Amino acid sequence: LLEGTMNLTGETQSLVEQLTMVKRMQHIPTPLFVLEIWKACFVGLIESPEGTEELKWTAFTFLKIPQVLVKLKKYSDFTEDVNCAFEFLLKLTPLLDKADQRCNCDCTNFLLQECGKQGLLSEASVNNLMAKRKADREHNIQPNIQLILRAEPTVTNILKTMDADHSKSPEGLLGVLGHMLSGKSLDLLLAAAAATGKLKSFARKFINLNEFTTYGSEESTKPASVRALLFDISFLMLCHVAQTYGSEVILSESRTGAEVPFFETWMQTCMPEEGKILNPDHPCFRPDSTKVESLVALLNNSSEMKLVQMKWHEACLSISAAILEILNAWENGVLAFESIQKITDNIKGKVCSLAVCAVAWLVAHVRMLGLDEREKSLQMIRQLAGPLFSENTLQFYNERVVIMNSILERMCADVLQQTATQIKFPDTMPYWNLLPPKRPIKEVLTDIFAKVLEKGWVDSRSIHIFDTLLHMGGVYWFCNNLIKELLKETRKEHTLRAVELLYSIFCLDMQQVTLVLLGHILPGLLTDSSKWHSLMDPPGTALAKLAVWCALSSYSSASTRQKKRHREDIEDYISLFPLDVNMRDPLNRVLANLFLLISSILGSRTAGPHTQFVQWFMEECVDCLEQSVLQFMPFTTVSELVKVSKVVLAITDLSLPLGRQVAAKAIAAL
Amino acid sequence: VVADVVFVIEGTANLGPYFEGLRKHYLLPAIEYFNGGPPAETDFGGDYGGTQYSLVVFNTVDCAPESYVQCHAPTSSAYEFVTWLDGIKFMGGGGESCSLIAEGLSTALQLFDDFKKMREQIGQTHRVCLLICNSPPYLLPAVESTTYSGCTTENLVQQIGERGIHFSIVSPRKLPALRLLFEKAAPPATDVSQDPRHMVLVRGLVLPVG
Amino acid sequence: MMDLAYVCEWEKWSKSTHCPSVPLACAWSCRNLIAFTMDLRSDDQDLTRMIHILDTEHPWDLHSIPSEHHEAITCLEWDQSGSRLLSADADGQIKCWSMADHLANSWESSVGSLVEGDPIVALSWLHNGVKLALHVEKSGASSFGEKFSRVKFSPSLTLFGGKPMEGWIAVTVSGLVTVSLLKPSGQVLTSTESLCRLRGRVALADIAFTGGGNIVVATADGSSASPVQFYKVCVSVVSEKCRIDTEILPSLFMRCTTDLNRKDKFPAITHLKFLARDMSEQVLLCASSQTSSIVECWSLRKETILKWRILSATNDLDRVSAVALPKLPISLTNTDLKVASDTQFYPGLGLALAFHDGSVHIVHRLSLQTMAVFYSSVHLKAMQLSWTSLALVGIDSHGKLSVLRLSPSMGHPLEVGLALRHLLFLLEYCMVTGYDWWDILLHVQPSMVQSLVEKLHEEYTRQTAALQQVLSTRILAMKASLCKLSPCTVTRVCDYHTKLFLIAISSTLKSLLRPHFLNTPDKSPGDRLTEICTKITDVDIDKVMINLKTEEFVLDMNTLQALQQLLQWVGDFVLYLLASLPNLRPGHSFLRDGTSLGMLRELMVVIRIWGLLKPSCLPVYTATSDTQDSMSLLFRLLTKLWICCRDEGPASEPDEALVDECCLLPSQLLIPSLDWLPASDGLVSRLQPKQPLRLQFGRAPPKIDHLRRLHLGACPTEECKACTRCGCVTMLKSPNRTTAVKQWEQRWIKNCLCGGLWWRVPLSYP
Amino acid sequence: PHWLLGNLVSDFVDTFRPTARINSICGRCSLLPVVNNSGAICNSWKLDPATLRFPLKGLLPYDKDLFEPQTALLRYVLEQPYSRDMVCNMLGLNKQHKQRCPVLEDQLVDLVVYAMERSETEEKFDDGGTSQLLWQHLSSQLIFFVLFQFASFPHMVLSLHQKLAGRGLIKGRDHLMWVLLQFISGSIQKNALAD
Numbered sequence A: 001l002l003e004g005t006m007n008l009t010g011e012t013q014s015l016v017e018q019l020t021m022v023k024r025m026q027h028i029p030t031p032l033f034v035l036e037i038w039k040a041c042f043v044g045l046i047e048s049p050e051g052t053e054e055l056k057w058t059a060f061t062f063l064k065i066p067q068v069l070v071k072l073k074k075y076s077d078f079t080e081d082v083n084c085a086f087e088f089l090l091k092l093t094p095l096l097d098k099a100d101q102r103c104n105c106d107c108t109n110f111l112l113q114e115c116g117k118q119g120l121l122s123e124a125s126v127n128n129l130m131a132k133r134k135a136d137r138e139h140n141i142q143p144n145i146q147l148i149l150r151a152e153p154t155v156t157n158i159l160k161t162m163d164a165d166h167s168k169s170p171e172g173l174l175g176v177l178g179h180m181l182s183g184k185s186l187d188l189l190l191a192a193a194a195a196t197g198k199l200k201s202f203a204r205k206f207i208n209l210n211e212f213t214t215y216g217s218e219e220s221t222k223p224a225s226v227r228a229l230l231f232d233i234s235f236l237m238l239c240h241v242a243q244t245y246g247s248e249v250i251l252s253e254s255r256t257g258a259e260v261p262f263f264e265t266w267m268q269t270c271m272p273e274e275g276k277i278l279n280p281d282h283p284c285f286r287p288d289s290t291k292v293e294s295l296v297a298l299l300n301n302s303s304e305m306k307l308v309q310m311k312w313h314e315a316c317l318s319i320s321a322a323i324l325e326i327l328n329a330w331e332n333g334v335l336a337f338e339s340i341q342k343i344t345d346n347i348k349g350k351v352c353s354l355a356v357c358a359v360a361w362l363v364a365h366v367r368m369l370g371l372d373e374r375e376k377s378l379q380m381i382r383q384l385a386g387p388l389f390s391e392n393t394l395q396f397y398n399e400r401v402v403i404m405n406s407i408l409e410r411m412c413a414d415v416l417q418q419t420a421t422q423i424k425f426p427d428t429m430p431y432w433n434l435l436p437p438k439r440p441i442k443e444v445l446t447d448i449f450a451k452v453l454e455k456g457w458v459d460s461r462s463i464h465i466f467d468t469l470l471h472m473g474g475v476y477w478f479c480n481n482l483i484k485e486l487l488k489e490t491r492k493e494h495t496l497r498a499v500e501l502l503y504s505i506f507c508l509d510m511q512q513v514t515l516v517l518l519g520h521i522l523p524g525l526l527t528d529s530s531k532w533h534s535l536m537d538p539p540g541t542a543l544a545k546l547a548v549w550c551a552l553s554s555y556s557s558a559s560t561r562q563k564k565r566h567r568e569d570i571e572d573y574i575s576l577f578p579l580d581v582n583m584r585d586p587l588n589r590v591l592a593n594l595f596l597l598i599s600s601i602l603g604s605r606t607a608g609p610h611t612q613f614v615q616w617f618m619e620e621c622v623d624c625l626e627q628s629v630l631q632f633m634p635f636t637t638v639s640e641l642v643k644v645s646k647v648v649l650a651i652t653d654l655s656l657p658l659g660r661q662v663a664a665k666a667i668a669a670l
Numbered sequence B: 001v002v003a004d005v006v007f008v009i010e011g012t013a014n015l016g017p018y019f020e021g022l023r024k025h026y027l028l029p030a031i032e033y034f035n036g037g038p039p040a041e042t043d044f045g046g047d048y049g050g051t052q053y054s055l056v057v058f059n060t061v062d063c064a065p066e067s068y069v070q071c072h073a074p075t076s077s078a079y080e081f082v083t084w085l086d087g088i089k090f091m092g093g094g095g096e097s098c099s100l101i102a103e104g105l106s107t108a109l110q111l112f113d114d115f116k117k118m119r120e121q122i123g124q125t126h127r128v129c130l131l132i133c134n135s136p137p138y139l140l141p142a143v144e145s146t147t148y149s150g151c152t153t154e155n156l157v158q159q160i161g162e163r164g165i166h167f168s169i170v171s172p173r174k175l176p177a178l179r180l181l182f183e184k185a186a187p188p189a190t191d192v193s194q195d196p197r198h199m200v201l202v203r204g205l206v207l208p209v210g
Numbered sequence C: 001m002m003d004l005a006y007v008c009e010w011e012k013w014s015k016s017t018h019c020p021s022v023p024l025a026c027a028w029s030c031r032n033l034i035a036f037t038m039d040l041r042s043d044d045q046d047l048t049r050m051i052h053i054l055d056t057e058h059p060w061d062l063h064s065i066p067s068e069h070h071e072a073i074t075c076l077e078w079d080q081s082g083s084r085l086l087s088a089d090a091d092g093q094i095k096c097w098s099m100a101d102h103l104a105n106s107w108e109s110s111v112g113s114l115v116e117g118d119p120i121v122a123l124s125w126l127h128n129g130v131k132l133a134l135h136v137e138k139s140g141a142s143s144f145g146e147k148f149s150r151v152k153f154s155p156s157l158t159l160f161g162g163k164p165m166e167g168w169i170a171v172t173v174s175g176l177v178t179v180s181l182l183k184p185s186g187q188v189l190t191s192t193e194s195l196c197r198l199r200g201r202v203a204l205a206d207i208a209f210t211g212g213g214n215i216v217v218a219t220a221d222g223s224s225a226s227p228v229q230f231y232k233v234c235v236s237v238v239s240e241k242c243r244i245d246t247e248i249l250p251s252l253f254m255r256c257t258t259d260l261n262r263k264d265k266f267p268a269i270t271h272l273k274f275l276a277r278d279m280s281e282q283v284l285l286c287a288s289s290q291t292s293s294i295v296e297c298w299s300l301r302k303e304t305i306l307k308w309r310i311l312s313a314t315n316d317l318d319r320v321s322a323v324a325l326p327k328l329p330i331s332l333t334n335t336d337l338k339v340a341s342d343t344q345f346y347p348g349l350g351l352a353l354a355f356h357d358g359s360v361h362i363v364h365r366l367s368l369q370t371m372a373v374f375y376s377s378v379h380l381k382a383m384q385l386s387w388t389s390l391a392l393v394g395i396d397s398h399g400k401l402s403v404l405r406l407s408p409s410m411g412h413p414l415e416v417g418l419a420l421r422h423l424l425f426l427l428e429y430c431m432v433t434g435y436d437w438w439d440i441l442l443h444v445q446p447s448m449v450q451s452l453v454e455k456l457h458e459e460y461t462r463q464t465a466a467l468q469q470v471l472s473t474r475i476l477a478m479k480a481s482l483c484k485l486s487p488c489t490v491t492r493v494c495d496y497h498t499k500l501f502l503i504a505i506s507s508t509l510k511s512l513l514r515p516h517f518l519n520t521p522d523k524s525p526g527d528r529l530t531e532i533c534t535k536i537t538d539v540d541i542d543k544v545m546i547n548l549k550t551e552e553f554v555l556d557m558n559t560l561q562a563l564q565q566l567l568q569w570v571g572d573f574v575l576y577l578l579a580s581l582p583n584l585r586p587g588h589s590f591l592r593d594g595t596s597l598g599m600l601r602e603l604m605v606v607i608r609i610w611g612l613l614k615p616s617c618l619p620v621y622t623a624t625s626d627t628q629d630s631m632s633l634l635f636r637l638l639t640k641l642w643i644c645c646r647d648e649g650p651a652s653e654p655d656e657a658l659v660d661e662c663c664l665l666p667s668q669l670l671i672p673s674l675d676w677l678p679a680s681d682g683l684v685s686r687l688q689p690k691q692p693l694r695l696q697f698g699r700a701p702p703k704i705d706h707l708r709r710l711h712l713g714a715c716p717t718e719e720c721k722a723c724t725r726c727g728c729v730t731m732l733k734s735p736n737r738t739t740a741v742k743q744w745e746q747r748w749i750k751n752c753l754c755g756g757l758w759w760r761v762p763l764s765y766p
Numbered sequence D: 001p002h003w004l005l006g007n008l009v010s011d012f013v014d015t016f017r018p019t020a021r022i023n024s025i026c027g028r029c030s031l032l033p034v035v036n037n038s039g040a041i042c043n044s045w046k047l048d049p050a051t052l053r054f055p056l057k058g059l060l061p062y063d064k065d066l067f068e069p070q071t072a073l074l075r076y077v078l079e080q081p082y083s084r085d086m087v088c089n090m091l092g093l094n095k096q097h098k099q100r101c102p103v104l105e106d107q108l109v110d111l112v113v114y115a116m117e118r119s120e121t122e123e124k125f126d127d128g129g130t131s132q133l134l135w136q137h138l139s140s141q142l143i144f145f146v147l148f149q150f151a152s153f154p155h156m157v158l159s160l161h162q163k164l165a166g167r168g169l170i171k172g173r174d175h176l177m178w179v180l181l182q183f184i185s186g187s188i189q190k191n192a193l194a195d
C-alpha cells in the first residue's frame, strides 16, 4: 500500500527485493504472502479517491503487481501457491463485491485473465477459478480496467509511431494529440506507462517533440499556427507529468553536450514543486533587457499577428521579466487596470503555456513579498488564470484550458493558502493540507498511530500524514515518539502488530530511521538506568525484533522529500561515534558502536531488563539471518553470550580462520 | 462610594518589622471604610464600575539590575488586595537611608491616568493615594517612567496635590521630609495615630480616632 | 588579542561512551553566572539533563540543577535581570527556574509552559522596554547622562501603567508560537497559535523585538535553498487571555545559491541570529556544507517598500561550530564608528566564530572582516560573550570549559592613558547599570591600578549630587575589587569593606530610633545627633550625652538587647583602632579620616544612652582594673584623635600625649582580635597574563558570621552562605527568629553589603 | 509482569485470548437500547458505577475496548427524554441513599458542554432545531440528578468552568445560566450559600 501510494513509478526490482526481504524476516508462507499482496491492492483500490488516484491504483494492481509476481517466481512450484492464494482470496466475497462496485465490472475476471497471460496461473486453474467466482457472483461506458489494459499497447505503439512525427506530418500529430487531450485519455496513458516502467521514454519523446517545435521554420500563418499548438500540447502534457509523477522522470540523467532541452531547464529553475521554492531574482528569471522590450511591445501590439517566427523558448523565458516590468508599471500607477486586462488577454489567449510561465514567476514573487504588498500581484493571477478568452483560439482550446487550470491549481495552492484567497478555477489535490491548523503535532501522530493499530493496517491518507510528519518534525522526533507509543503497550498481540506496522511506516526513510534507532534511541534506552523498566518482556521482545529487522533491511538496501532532505543533511558520523569494511559509511559505524554497547552490557554486573533485551536482540539476529549484520560483532561476545546463556555461536562468528578458534573454544566449553 | 484606591508601599528592610502593626491599625480599617464590612471570598473582580484597589511597591537602588517598581493591576476585590498586602516580602536595603519615592509616585500617577481613561461613566470620583513609607526620599528625579521622567518628588507631589487626588502618608517613624511632602500635596482650595511614635496624616478617608 | 584565563575540566567523568553527542546550551547572565549543559553520560542520561551554574569568580564550585527535562535541553535564557533562568527542551516543557531563598546555589521552578511533543527551537524573554546606548565619543564628557542614554524603546505588552509584563515567547519546530505572561500574582497565561496558515517546518528560528512592541521571529527550515521567512507577532491581553496576532514580513533567499559557478555547496543553513535582540533589522545567517561555511549579514532597509539586501559575507571558512554575538549596546552610528576606529575601542563590534578546527575568529559586525584570531592549542561547541564583551566563555568537544579574555583594542598596543580611559568607561557603564565588573578586572594590569582608582574618585565627584548618592556602595565595591589587584594597593581593601560595614551599621542604628515626639522639628534625630556631636567637642562622654534629649533615644528593651553583637563590634573596632594608633595594618586609613571617627563618636554616644536604659546591650571589655569606665576612656581618646582631623584643611599629625595614652591601652584593656572581611579566594588576583589556570571541577585550588557578629565554633554545626565577591559568611537561617533585629537582618536577604550574591557553602563533617 | 517471569506469563495469558473471544458479544460497545420508562431493566445494560465499565465474567483477556469506560451508551441514554429510572438502574442508584456518584457527574458536565457547543454552531437557521429541546431536557434531567445529591452542585460548576475556560464558547450562555437558575431557584433554601 505504501508503494502504491507514494511511488507508483518505482522500479519493480526494488519492490521485489523489499518483499523478499520481508518474507525472509518474518517467515511467511507463499500463499499467505500473495494473498496479502492481493488484499492490499484491492483494499487500496476501494479506498482510493475518485479521479487520477483511482486510475493509478487500477494500473498498480492490474499491471505492476502481476509483473512483480513474475519476478518473484524467477527468484524463487509458484503456480500452485498463487492458485492457493487465489482460492484464499475468492473466499472473501464482501471485499470483492465492494471492489466490483467501484470497478463497475467484475475485476477478478480481469485479474485471472491477466495472471494467465503472465503465466503465474495454469489455464485449468484460471477456468475453475472463474467458474467459482461466477457462482459466487450470482448471489455503455468501458470500465477503467479495460481502458488501461488496452491502453498499455497503445502506449507502446504510440511510442513507435510518434518517433517519426507521423512521418513529419504535424497536422496528424495535432489531431492525435488533441484526441489524447480529450477526457481522461492522457491520464490513462500515463498511468499505464508509469505502472509499466515506460514513463521515462514517454517523457523523452514529448521533450524531443518540444525541442523540435521550439524554433520552427520559415512558414506562413497556417503552418506556424500548427507549430505553436504543438508547443502548447507538448508543454502542457509535460507539466502535467512533472506535477503528477514527480520531476525526476523529466530529467535526462546524462546529457552529453550542453544541449539540455528547454523544458528541462524551465522545470529545473522555474516551476514550483512541493519541496521546491524558487528565487524570483535568480539569474534564470533575468535573461536580457533587449528581448524583453521586444516582448512587451509584442504583447502591446495586438493579436501577435507575428506567431510565424517566435522562438517560443525565448518568449517563455522572457515572460517573467515582462510581467515584472508590467507589475512595476502598475505599482507606480503609470498603467491602468484596463490595459492590464489587454496584456493578460494577449498572454493567455493564443498560447496557454505563456500563462503558466507567468504564473510560475508570479507565485515565486508573491511568496517573497510581505502581507500588505501582495494585493496587486494576486489580481494578475486572477486574470492569467481566469476563464477563457474567446473568438481567436487556435484549436483544442477548451481541453488546454482544462489542463492549464489543473496546473495552475497545483502551482498556486500554497501561496493562496498563506492568505485566505479563493481563485476558484472550476478534486485533483486529494491529499493536500492534511494537518489541523493549530494542534501540536504529537497529538496528530499518536491519534493516527492509535487508529492504525486498531484497524490493523495503514491507510493511504495515514501514509500521507505520516510522510508529512516525518518531513516536519524530523527523523529523530518521529522515530522516538512512535517507539514511545510502542513501549507503552502491555499486550503481546498489540505489541507484535505495532512492530509489524512500524517497520512499514519506517520504510519511508529506512536508512535514516535505522541510524536514529540504533544510534540514538536504543543506546539511550540501554544506557539510562531509569529507562530500562520500559524494556520489559512484552514490548521489549517486539522492540528487539523491530531493531533487528531495521538493521538487516538497511544493511542489504525512498521518497522525494527524503531524497531532498538527506541531500540537505550534513553530519560527521566519525565524530558522533568515535569508536574507542569501509567504516566511513555511517551504518557500519552505528552497528559497530551498538555491538560494543551490547558486549559491554553483557559483560557487566547488575543484570536487569536491559540484559534480557540484548539477549533477545542477539537471538533474533541469529534467527533472522540466512547466513551480514553480525560481521561487526566483537569476538568477545562469542565468549560472553553463553556465560549469560550453540547456534548463537555458530551463526554469529562469520567463520574466518581465526573465527573458528573462537567458535571451537565456545562450543566445546559450553 | 466609588473609589480609586492606590497604595504606595516601600518594600525595603525598613518598614519590614513595622508593617504588620501598621496593617492592623491603619491599612486594614481604611480598606474596610472603602469596602463596608471586612472582605471574605465572595468579592468578584470585573465590575468596572465600583471601587478599584491597586498596589505599587517600590525599592531602593540596591536592587541594581532589577526594576524599581512592582505594580499590580487594579482589582475590585478587597480580598485579593488583602492577599497582595500579605504577599509583599520586605527584603531590600543595605547601606542607605533613602528610597525611591519618586518612582512609586510616578507610577501612581500613571495608574490614575489609566483609571481616568477607564471610568467615563463618572467624570470624577474619590481618587485616594496612600504612601506607606519609612524613609526620606532620594534626590534622584524619576527615571523609570514615561511622561513623568526627570521630575523630583516635589513636582510629582504638586501634580498629585492639584487635580484633586487625596494624598495620605502613614509612617511608623516620624520624619520631616514626609511631613513637608504632605503639606505640599494640598488639595486645590483629628488624631488618627493609635501609637504616638507612628506619623499618620490622612487628607482623605476616615480611620477610627485613637 | 586572546588569552585563556582558565580551563576547567571534569575529573574522570568524561569519556562519554556508546551514546552520541548532543548540542549544548550556554548562557551568561548580567550577574556573572554561567548556566550551561554538558554531555556527561555516566550511569544515567540525566547527567545530560543537568544545568550547571558556575559563578565565574569561583569556578571549582559548580552547582548542578537536576532539571526534570525528559528530552535534551535546547535553549537556556537568563532574565533581563540575572534572577531567573528559562530552559526549554525538545517536547515542549519550558521551565522557569528561580532562586530558592535568594541563594545562587538553589534553584527551583514553579512556573512553566508546555506544548507537548513539539520541540522548542527558539526561546526568549519578553522585552521590558529598557534600552540604553553608549556614546564612546563622549567618554570624557564628565557626566553619565552624556555617556549612556536611554533610547525610548517600548515594551511588548504594557499593562495598566508604564509597567511591562514579564513573560516568554517560544517557537516550536512546527509552525507554532507560544507566549506565556506572568502576572504579578502567581498566575500565568499561555497562548499558542500557528505562525502562518501554511504550516511548515521551522528548523532554525530566532526572535528580536522592535520599537512599537512587536516581536519579529525568523524561521528557516535548514535547506539553504528555501527562503528565510519572517513574521511580525503582536501580543495583547483580551480581558482574561493572551492573544497573538501574526503577519508575514518580507522573506529573503540567500546568496551562494545564485552564485551559478558551483551553487550546490553549502546546502545547510546552520545558524540564524539577529544581530541583537531589539535590533530586528539585521540578520546573520550561516550556510554550511560538511567542511566549509559562509556567514552573511542582511538588512531590511526600505526603498517593494521593504526588501532584504546583503551587507557583507565572508569568503570561505571552516565549518562554523558556534556563534556568539555581543551584548554591549554601542551606538553604532558613523561618528562613533570613526572614533572607535581612531581610539581603538573594539568591545561592541565583534562576533566570535568558532570553527571545527581549534581556531576562533573575532570578526567585525558590519563588514565581516576578521579582527583577531585565537588558535586553540577539539572545537568550541558553545560560546558566549560577556555583557561588557571583554571575555568569552566556551564549552569544548570534551568536558573542558574555558574563559578567554579579549583585549579591548584586539591586541594592537595602546598607550596607557587610552587603556585607562577604555576600562574606566566600562567600569562607569557597570556602575550606572548594576552589572558585574569581573571581566574588566581580567584586563586590569597591576601597574595601572592606582591611577585607575584616582580616576574613579574624580568621576565620583562632579556628578549631580543624586548620582553621588546612588553610586556610593557601588564605587566602594569597585574600589575594593580594583585595589585587590596590585601588591602596592592590596593593603587598603580591608578598610573599604569595614567602611561599608560602618555605614551599614551607622544608618541602621540611626534608623532604629523613632522619636516619640517632635522637638526642634525639621531635623530628624540622626541629624540632630550629628549636629550635636559635631558642635560639642567635649572630651567627656557625659557632657555630650547631657545635651542630647535622651528621652527620645528609647527602644523597647527587647531589640535593644538583641543589638548586643553589633554594639560589641562597634566598641571592639574602636578599641582596636586606638590601640593600633602607635604603629600599614587593617586600620591605617581610619586614623586620618575625620568623618568615620565622627561616626564612631556618634555610635559611642548612642551606645552610652542605650546602656543607661538597659545595661545588657553594652559591649564588654575585659578590664585590667575594676574602678574603670572603659567607654568614657575610649571616647576621650577618640575625641582627642578626631579633633585632629575635624579641622579645616588640617592633616594634623597626632601629638605624643595621645600616642602614650594609646600605648597604655593594652595595659588597661585586652585588645581582642578582629575578622577582616575579604578572605580572598578570587581568581583575578591569582591569575597572570600568558598563563592559564587548569582546574578540576569540585577541587578548589576562627570562623565567624560577619554580618550578625556571632562566633561559630571550630567546625560549625549550622550551615552558611558565603558572599561571592567579598567572601563574608553568614549562617543561613536566623538563630533566634523571635529576637531578631529585622531592620538589620532584612537588609542582606538578597545580597551581601558589598553587592555580591549569596552562595550556600557545604558543611565539613570532619 | 515481573522482569524475571516475563514471556512465561504474558504468552500464557495470550493463549486465553480465544476463550475471551468466545465470551464477547461482538459490537457490544455500539449496541444501544430503546429507552422505555417501564422499568424491569434487562441486566445487559448495567454498568459499573465506579468506573463506567461493563461488568465482565471472569478474569480473561477481553478485547481492549471492553476495558474502557462506556461513555457513549450513557450519553445516548441521558440525551433521551424520560430516561430517569433507566440511568438509575444502569448505575445502580437507589434514591434511599445519596452518594455523589462521580462519573455520572462528569458525564452530565460533558453533556452540558456538548449542548453549549451545538448551541454555538448556529442555533439560528432552525428556530426549534433540536437545540432548545435539548436545553429543556437538560434542565429536567440535571434538576433530578443534582437534587437528590447523586451529583453535587459546586464541583459540577467548577468542573464546568474548567471545561469552558479558554474554549471560547459564547453564543448560548443564557441557556446555561437558565439551567443553573433552575438549580439555585430549586434548592437555595436547603443548602448554604457557599455551595
Ligand SMILES: [Zn+2]
Binding pocket: C723, C724, C725, C726, C727, C728, C752, C753, C754, C755, C756
Ligand atoms: Zn560581600
